[PDB]
Curated annotation (Swiss-Prot), chain B:
GO terms for biological process: defense response to virus. It comes from the Bacteria. This is CRISPR-associated protein Cse2. Signal peptide: none annotated. Homodimer. The keyword ATP-binding does not apply. CRISPR (clustered regularly interspaced short palindromic repeat), is an adaptive immune system that provides protection against mobile genetic elements (viruses, transposable elements and conjugative plasmids). CRISPR clusters contain sequences complementary to antecedent mobile elements and target invading nucleic acids. CRISPR clusters are transcribed and processed into CRISPR RNA (crRNA). Belongs to the CRISPR-associated CasB/Cse2 family. It comes from Thermus thermophilus (strain ATCC 27634 / DSM 579 / HB8). Keywords: Antiviral defense, Plasmid. The keyword tRNA-binding does not apply.
Amino acid sequence: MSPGERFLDWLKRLQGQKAWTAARAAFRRSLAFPPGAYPRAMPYVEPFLAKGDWRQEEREAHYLVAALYALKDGDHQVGRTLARALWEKASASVEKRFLALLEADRDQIAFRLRQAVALVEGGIDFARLLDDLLRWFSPERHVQARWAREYYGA
Amino acid sequence: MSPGERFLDWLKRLQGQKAWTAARAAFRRSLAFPPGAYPRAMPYVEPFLAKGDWRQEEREAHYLVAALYALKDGDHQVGRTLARALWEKAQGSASVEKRFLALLEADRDQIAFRLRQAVALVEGGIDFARLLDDLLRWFSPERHVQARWAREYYGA
């Protein structure tokens, strides 16, 4: 059972509860900020986080995914990765956006990632998104490679 | 067709196309990074790769050959292999034979750097198709490619 899958489970269960309303507003509000730097969003994520040992970029990855999930309003389509979604939205100009995503550094990744999620139509697999973001920064650049195969695979 | 054959073909179509200028620069820029980890070079290669099933190292080989081909502005001459060319160059310098040997023993971390360095060293065209085919099988346990390379070099 993947860390991405677990989180999505946590996020899904969260959406059915009464708190979803405040939570969603909190997640959506957090985009203005660096992931994990918005306290309102914190009650919703920190408890899930307490179970593991997470390095900082890992918490950020979780917080980011929660916000993006909130954007798509819980719209999680399994099997459909963002890269594929990005391909499906076309278009030449998009192909620049997708590459620009791959070359993003920690500074720009959340923003570019956010901009990219708003753009696609439908839902994307958020469990996949988290597992992929968790390993985004290996020196090998293997995740980015797979996204390429995914995007150009379509 | 061999895989090196099919790729070289692809590269050649690319060269006689308006995009070539940009691709040449993108492939050149990529030498600064590990093969396949440079996004701006992607558009030129992934569409080709998508039509096949490749292990990562195999995918990496293509990217490397693509950058090397660009480094030499497409100067490809069938039958003139990298080893033969390195030999020919070595009549001019004894320094070369030393470099070729280090190339031969190259491991996964060194192969890109040493290959690049060796390709720049030679004069004339080399057979890029044969090169890709060789690169793909570089890590075979029986070391067939390296042996053949030693044959070409010390059999000249």
